[PDB]
């Protein structure tokens, strides 16, 4: 645990925790490929349980990176193609607006304005079909990016259909297990509840509630140890033994679309490194519709990139960022949803300092 790392981490995180009034937090810094952990505060204020390297946090939208990689793996296995129309894996979507909408559009939020959230009233599989059949796109496919859980969420569900596995089974078997993410869950088992931190919203302890396409869009819970391991896997996919998974991780980091200085991958988002934090630039804007330029054909993962993803649930705030070229990365998990810009600022300050 190099004093340089200790020092920048503490000098950056302490002020952050105090300004944002965050109950508990865990940070991991990947340096020259090795992880270093830090923890503060409480996982459960009422029961005075401290945050540890085994505390599980709700990852929120950071879960989409797992989804993008599982999708990438399915492509590598020849089970699906990003150029395939959505209807190929859901024949019941007969509504004409779906014609030129492909799995690529779904995965990158470019289908034409799919909504940010699947409505609460959508429960059953039947309800989901009705929702997508009735949705009227605001734009032609491939012209604008509008971040949406209902978009990559459908991608995840369809991507695992030829496999015959449930999304959760495919994820556990093809991603979690092979990477030894043995304390990463879509559904927390009773035996692990002891380590599940509570999120805090306006002072109340809360956990994410069930929702349609939740697993695919924002339902993963994980530890700071497994997330550091997830970052390492994405920093150096070449060390991964499972071939389709290695390929899948690389596909998730390809640049499919460009908007401003940002590039859209599968789950992950990227910017060329070096980059100043002002450029990242990625926050909320309850919704920002942005025109996109197609990258034809997509650029393979660029090593000199700042690769990242933010995430939140009602009671948790998370962030992951890494730079392949420098074998550097960071994971910040907190049980309070706080401003995205404060996350990016903290991470940048730490990584820029270390390399
Ligand atoms: C990923 O983290 C996504 N978050 C959600 O879907 C949820 N909340 O997002 C916001 C918009 C911040 C909210 O408070 O409503 C959510 C899931 S389960 C639950 N209780 N809440 C997307 N993330 C962001 C972000 O920048 O945090 C978005 C702007 C779009 S939704």
UniProtKB/Swiss-Prot annotation:
GO molecular function annotations of the record: beta-lactamase activity
One GO term of the biological process aspect: response to antibiotic
Family annotation (Pfam families): Beta-lactamase
Residues binding a beta-lactam, per UniProt: 61, 117, 147, 149, 312, 337
Cellular compartments annotated: Periplasm
Catalyzed reaction equations: a beta-lactam + H2O = a substituted beta-amino acid
UniProt enzyme class: hydrolase
NCBIfam families, per the entry: bla_class_C (NF033085), BlaEC (NF000185), CMY2-MIR-ACT-EC (NF012173)
Family listed: Belongs to the class-C beta-lactamase family.
Role: Class C beta-lactamase which confers resistance to penicillins and cephalosporins. Has benzylpenicillin- and cephaloridine-hydrolyzing activity. Has weak cefuroxime, cefotaxime, cefoxitin and oxacillin-hydrolyzing activities.
Protein's name according to its UniProt entry: Beta-lactamase
Gene name for this UniProt entry: ampC
């Amino acid at each position: 645990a190099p004093q340089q790392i200790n020092d920048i981490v503490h000098r950056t995180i302490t002020p952050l925790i105090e300004q944002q009034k965050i109950p508990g937090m865990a940070v991991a810094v990947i340096y020259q490929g090795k992880p270093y952990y830090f923890t503060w505060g409480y996982a459960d204020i009422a029961k005075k349980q401290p945050v540890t390297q085994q505390t599980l946090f709700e990852l929120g939208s950071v879960s989409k990176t797992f989804t993008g990689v599982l999708g990438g793996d399915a492509i590598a296995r020849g089970e699906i193609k990003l150029s395939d129309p959505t209807t190929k894996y859901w024949p019941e979507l007969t509504a004409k607006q779906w014609n030129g909408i492909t799995l690529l559009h779904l995965a990158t939020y470019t289908a034409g304005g799919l909504p940010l959230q699947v409505p609460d009233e959508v429960k059953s599989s039947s309800d989901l079909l009705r929702f997508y059949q009735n949705w009227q796109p605001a734009w032609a496919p491939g012209t604008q990016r509008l971040y949406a859980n209902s978009s990559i969420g459908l991608f995840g569900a369809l991507a695992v259909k030829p496999s015959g596995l449930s999304f959760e089974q495919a994820m556990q078997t093809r991603v979690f297990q092979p990477l030894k993410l043995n304390h990463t869950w879509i559904n927390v088992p009773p035996a692990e509840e002891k380590n599940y931190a509570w999120g805090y919203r306006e002072g109340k302890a809360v956990h994410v509630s069930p929702g349609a396409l939740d697993a695919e869009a924002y339902g993963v819970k994980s530890t700071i140890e497994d997330m550091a391991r997830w970052v390492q896997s994405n920093l150096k996919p070449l060390d991964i033994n499972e071939k389709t998974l290695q390929q899948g991780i690389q596909l998730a980091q390809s640049r499919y679309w460009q908007t401003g200085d940002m590039y859209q991958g599968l789950g992950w988002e990227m910017l060329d490194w070096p980059v100043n934090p002002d450029s990242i630039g990625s926050d909320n804007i309850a919704l920002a519709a942005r025109p996109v330029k197609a990258i034809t054909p997509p650029t393979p993962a660029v090593r000199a990139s700042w690769v990242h993803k933010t995430g939140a649930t009602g009671g948790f705030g998370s962030y992951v960022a890494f730079i392949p070229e420098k074998e550097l990365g960071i994971v910040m998990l907190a049980n309070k949803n706080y401003p995205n810009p404060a996350r990016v600022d903290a991470a940048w300050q730490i990584l820029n300092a270390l390399q």
